[PDB]
Amino acid sequence: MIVNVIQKDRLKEQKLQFIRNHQQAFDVEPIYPLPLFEDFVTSIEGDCSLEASCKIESDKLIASRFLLFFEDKTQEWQKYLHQSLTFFGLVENRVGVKINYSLLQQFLGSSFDFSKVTVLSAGIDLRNNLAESSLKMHIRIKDYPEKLDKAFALSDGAADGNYLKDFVNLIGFDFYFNGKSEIEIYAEVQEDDFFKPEINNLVWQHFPKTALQPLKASSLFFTGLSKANNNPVLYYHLKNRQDLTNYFKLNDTAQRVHSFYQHQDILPYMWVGTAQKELEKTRIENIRLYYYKSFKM
Numbered sequence: 001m002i003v004n005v006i007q008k009d010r011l012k013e014q015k016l017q018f019i020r021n022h023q024q025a026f027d028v029e030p031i032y033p034l035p036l037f038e039d040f041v042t043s044i045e046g047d048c049s050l051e052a053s054c055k056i057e058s059d060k061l062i063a064s065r066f067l068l069f070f071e072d073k074t075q076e077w078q079k080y081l082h083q084s085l086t087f088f089g090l091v092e093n094r095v096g097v098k099i100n101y102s103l104l105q106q107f108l109g110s111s112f113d114f115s116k117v118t119v120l121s122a123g124i125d126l127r128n129n130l131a132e133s134s135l136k137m138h139i140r141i142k143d144y145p146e147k148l149d150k151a152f153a154l155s156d157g158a159a160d161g162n163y164l165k166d167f168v169n170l171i172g173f174d175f176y177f178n179g180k181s182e183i184e185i186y187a188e189v190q191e192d193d194f195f196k197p198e199i200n201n202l203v204w205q206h207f208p209k210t211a212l213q214p215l216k217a218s219s220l221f222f223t224g225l226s227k228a229n230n231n232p233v234l235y236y237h238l239k240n241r242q243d244l245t246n247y248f249k250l251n252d253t254a255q256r257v258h259s260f261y262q263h264q265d266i267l268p269y270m271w272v273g274t275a276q277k278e279l280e281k282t283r284i285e286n287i288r289l290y291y292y293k294s295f296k297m
């Protein structure tokens, strides 16, 4: 048992370290209210992963973006949901804002089967403009067509984007501090399906050739269906973060993030998100970079 208390304290400090390393590299001052997220991730004593992310818009660097993934093998998804919602409610209380939950509420509405959840995340994207700050939640469902339909109904709605409805498993919620809220649905293609002829016909055919090149180094591909019908954001799960510069033409701000993380003590994979048209450019100006670390007993 003494092994357990020592390892719990150590995990608590390693999560805070991962968060501070990211914040201190990109923001001289922490963005308020980061310490509420720090308290939340330290209260999650089961196994988890953390995500630290940068959104780059030309030379603007948005870096107070963090996410916890619940990975306790007991899979008490409903308990994790409740722990995330009470953290959101603490943000509301301390900041003095009211979050608009209606989209999450309607998605969960008609008696939710939590056994169909395979991923749950909770986190933040904090800005000095409070109204532009947001809380975040992702839910991945499996073999749950009733809730797939409900998420589609909740976003912009039917076609198009409906052309990729059968590829959807991940649902994203954003909760802005001004009371605006959004839902997003993500179509995915797994590595083992990359070369199948039906996949080229149903998916790749609708994307420029440049969109296909980073699949060579990716184990997974996502795209958001409802935001930006024009110019959809494309997400690539790079097997090795070192391949980023080989497949994506980085500007100066993104290169600074990449250089910082090349030799950090983190997981080897990353996610890269970029709008479809950025890949047709000679140089990406808008890109989102996501890095990860795991925290296990």
Ligand SMILES: CC(C)(C)OC(=O)N[C@@H](Cc1ccc(O)cc1)C(=O)O
Binding pocket: 051, 067, 069, 118, 119, 121, 138, 140, 170, 271, 290
């Ligand atoms: C655990 C498995 C099934 C391998 O992951 C998923 O396909 N879901 C993604 C979805 C996701 C990725 C990044 C995010 O920031 C949010 C959600 C994931 O969790 O890795």
Ligand SMILES: CC(C)=CCSP(=O)(O)OP(=O)(O)O
Binding pocket: 055, 136, 172, 184, 186, 222, 233, 235, 271, 273, 288
């Ligand atoms: C698509 C998965 C792989 C990455 C997380 S996407 P997000 O919607 O939470 O981040 P953005 O809203 O695109 O900035």
Ligand SMILES: [Mg+2]
Binding pocket: 184, 224, 227
């Ligand atoms: Mg989004």
